[PDB]
Amino acid sequence: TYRDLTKALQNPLEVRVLDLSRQELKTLPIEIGKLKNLQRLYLHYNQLTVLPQEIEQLKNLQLLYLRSNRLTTLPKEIEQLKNLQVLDLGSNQLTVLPQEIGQLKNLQLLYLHSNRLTTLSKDIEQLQNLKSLDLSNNQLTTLPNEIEQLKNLKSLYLSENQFATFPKEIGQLQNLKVLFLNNNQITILPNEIAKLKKLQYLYLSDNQLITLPKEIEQLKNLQTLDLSYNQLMILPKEVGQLENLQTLDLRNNQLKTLPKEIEQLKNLQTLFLSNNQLTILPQEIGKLKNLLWLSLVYNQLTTLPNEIEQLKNLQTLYLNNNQFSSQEKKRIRKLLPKCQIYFD
Ligand SMILES: [Cl-]
Ligand SMILES: [Cl-]
Ligand SMILES: [Cl-]
Ligand SMILES: [Zn+2]
Ligand SMILES: [Zn+2]
Ligand SMILES: [Zn+2]
Ligand SMILES: [Zn+2]
Numbered sequence: 625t626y627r628d629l630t631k632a633l634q635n636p637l638e639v640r641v642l643d644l645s646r647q648e649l650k651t652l653p654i655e656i657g658k659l660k661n662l663q664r665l666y667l668h669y670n671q672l673t674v675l676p677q678e679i680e681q682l683k684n685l686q687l688l689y690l691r692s693n694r695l696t697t698l699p700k701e702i703e704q705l706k707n708l709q710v711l712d713l714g715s716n717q718l719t720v721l722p723q724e725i726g727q728l729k730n731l732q733l734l735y736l737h738s739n740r741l742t743t744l745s746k747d748i749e750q751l752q753n754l755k756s757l758d759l760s761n762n763q764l765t766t767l768p769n770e771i772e773q774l775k776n777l778k779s780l781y782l783s784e785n786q787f788a789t790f791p792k793e794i795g796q797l798q799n800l801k802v803l804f805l806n807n808n809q810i811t812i813l814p815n816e817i818a819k820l821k822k823l824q825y826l827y828l829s830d831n832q833l834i835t836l837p838k839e840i841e842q843l844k845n846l847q848t849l850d851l852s853y854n855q856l857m858i859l860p861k862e863v864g865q866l867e868n869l870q871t872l873d874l875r876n877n878q879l880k881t882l883p884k885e886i887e888q889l890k891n892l893q894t895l896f897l898s899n900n901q902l903t904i905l906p907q908e909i910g911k912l913k914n915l916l917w918l919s920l921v922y923n924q925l926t927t928l929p930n931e932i933e934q935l936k937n938l939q940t941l942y943l944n945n946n947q948f949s950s951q952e953k954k955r956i957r958k959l960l961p962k963c964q965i966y967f968d
Contacts, residue, residue: 625640625641625643626639626641626642626643627642627643627644629642629644629653629655629656632659633655633658633659636658636659636660637659637660637661638661639659639661639662640661640662640663640664641662641663641664641666642659642662642664642665642666643666644666644667644670645666645667645668645669645670646668646669646670647670648670648671649667649670649671649672650670650671650672650673651672651673651674651676652667652672652675652676652679654676654678655678656676656678656679656681656682657678657679657680657681657682658681659682660681660682660683660684661684662682662684662685663684663685663686663687664685664686664687664688664689665682665685665687665688665689666689667688667689667690667693668689668690668691668692668693669691669692669693670692670693671693671694672690672693672694672695673693673694673695673696674695674696674697674699675690675695675698675699675701675702676699677699677700677701678701679699679701679702679704679705680701680704680705682705683704683705683706683707684707685705685707685708686707686708686709686710687708687709687710687711687712688705688708688710688711688712689710689712690712690713690714690716691712691713691714691715691735692714692715692716693715693716694716694717695713695716695717695718696716696717696718696719697718697719697720697722698713698718698721698722698724698725699722700722700724701724702722702724702725702727702728703724703727703728704727705728706727706728706729706730707730708728708730708731709730709731709732709733709753710731710732710733710735711728711731711733711734711735712733712735713734713735713736713739714735714736714737714738714739714758715737715738715739716738716739717739717740718736718739718740718741719739719740719741719742720741720742720743720745721736721741721744721745721747722745723745723747725745725747725748725751726745726747726748726749726750726751727750728751729750729751729752729753730753731751731753731754732753732754732755732756733754733755733756734751734754734756734757734758735756735758736757736758736759736760736762737758737759737760737761737781738760738761738762739761739762740762740763741759741762741763741764742762742763742764742765743764743766743768744759744764744767744768744771745768746768746769746770747770748768748770748771748774749770749771749772749773749774751774752773752774752776753776754774754776754777755776755777755778755779756777756778756779756780757774757777757779757780757781758779758781759780759781759782759785760781760782760783760784760785760804761783761784761785762784762785763785763786764782764785764786764787765785765786765787765788765789766787766789766791767791767793767794768793769793771793771796771797772793772796772797774797775796775797775798775799776799777797777799777800778799778800778801778802779800779801779802780794780797780800780802780803780804781802781804782803782804782805782808783804783805783806783807783808783827784806784807784808785807785808786808786809787805787808787809787810788808788809788810788811789810789812790805790810790812790813790814790816790817792814792816794816794817794820795814795816795817795819795820796819797820798819798820798821798822799822800820800822800823801822801823801824801825801845802823802824802825803820803823803825803826803827804827805826805827805828805831806827806828806829806830806831806850807829807830807831808830808831809831809832810828810831810832810833811831811832811833811834811855812833812834812835813828813833813835813836813837813840814837815837815839817837817839817840817843818837818839818840818841818842818843819842820843821842821843821844821845822845823843823845823846824845824846824847824848824868825846825847825848826843826846826848826849826850827848827850828850828851828854829850829851829852829853829854829873830852830853830854831853831854832854832855833851833854833855833856834855834856834857835856835858835860836851836856836859836860836862836863837860837862838860838862839862840860840862840863840865840866841862841865841866843866844866844867844868845868846866846868846869847868847869847870847871847891848869848870848871848873849866849869849871849872849873850871850873851872851873851874851877852873852874852875852876852877852896853875853876853877854876854877855877855878856874856877856878856879857877857878857879857880858879858880859874859879859882859883860883861883861884861885862885863883863885863886864883864885864886864887864888864889865885865888866889867888867889867890867891868891869889869891869892870891870892870893870894871892871893871894872889872892872894872895872896873894873896874895874896874897874900875896875897875898875899875900875919876898876899876900877899877900878900878901879897879900879901879902880900880901880902880903881902881903881904881905881906882897882902882905882906882909883906884906884907884908885908886906886908886909886911886912887906887908887909887911887912889912890912890913890914891914892912892914892915893914893915893916893917894915894916894917894918895912895915895917895918895919896919897918897919897920897923898919898920898921898922898923898942899921899922899923900920900922900923901923901924902920902923902924902925903923903924903925903926904925904927905920905925905928905929905932906929907929907930907931908931909929909931909932909935910929910931910932910933910934910935911931911934912935913934913935913936913937914937915935915937915938916937916938916939916940917938917939917940918935918938918940918941918942919940919941919942920941920942920943920946921942921943921944921945921946922944922945922946923945923946924946924947925943925946925947925948926946926947926948926949926952927948927952928952928956928959930959932956932959932960933959933960935960935963936962938960938962938963939963939964940963940964941960941963941964941965941966942966943956943965943966943967944966944967944968948967953967
């Protein structure tokens with residue numbers, strides 16, 4: 625592992641890792657090609673506007689980390705980095721990916737969090753070894769039909785983009801376990817989500833969601849569902865069929881009630897329900913045997929069913945800013961003597 629270039633260049637065939645981060649580099653010197661055995665190249669937190677063609681000489685390069693630079697595109701020579709497995713272009717100014725991105729056949733991770741991408745390159749389909757794709761904080765409104773060919777992709781990040789519609793192409797990504805779609809403008813969650821049988825974590829925080837599809841019930845491997853900061857008025861009964869669900873974040877919505885089918889969520893440990901319009905909770909709330917945390921701060925609750933006493937594992941319960949009388953607060957305290965309860 626080398627941190628100084630001048631020193632790396634005096635003994636070129638010995639360098640394996642090169643870290644030129646925070647060195648105020650405007651350009652990557654062309655003499656960089658002399659490092660024939662280079663495996664990982666770290667050029668983060670510099671002011672690089674382009675990469676020179678001499679990167680073609682770096683045949684053994686497995687990792688290229690260019691986090692926080694001023695890159696606008698990648699050179700055609702990137703196609704010669706046949707052994708490249710990780711390419712990090714985070715916090716740059718990329719408007720487009722060159723067609724040569726499709727030539728990096730051994731790529732596993734492509735990190736593009738925070739750029740200026742308006743479309744995703746159609747040559748993404750050639751990246752058959754790609755397992756993680758981060759396209760967060762860009763200006764995407766759609767996904768190319770060619771992304772449907774990435775059957776082995778496991779993680780996809782699409783938070784902070786311009787998605788007014790959920791891209792149906794996601795439905796073909798059969799091996800996805802993680803999907804981030806936070807901070808978008810999605811109003812409808814279509815049934816294409818139900819095709820993701822291996823999906824474990826789904827993040828849809830800060831969208832404009834009104835309805836969840838009934839096909840959500842097919843998501844049997846789903847452990848985290850984040851629907852916070854949406855427009856949900858009704859939770860379909862099918863949400864109760866998410867057998868593996870451990871965390872459900874429904875804070876900051878417009879829910880009036882919870883379906884009685886919530887009783888089927890035997891693995892649920894954490895439920896966030898603050899800032900809703902809840903006037904009543906079903907007596908079936910008491911069947912949530914594994915529930916540890918429950919927050920209902922800022923709702924319209926005047927009472928709780930006696931069946932809350934069945935929540936034997938409940939450790940924390942936030943009840944602030946509701947419509948409980950001093951008599952109700954006293955009654956609720958008696959129902960849950962092993963639970964930490966907050967009223968004010
Ligand atoms: Cl992300
Ligand atoms: Cl973020
Ligand atoms: Cl909450
Ligand atoms: Zn060349
Ligand atoms: Zn990211
Ligand atoms: Zn971000
Ligand atoms: Zn196409």
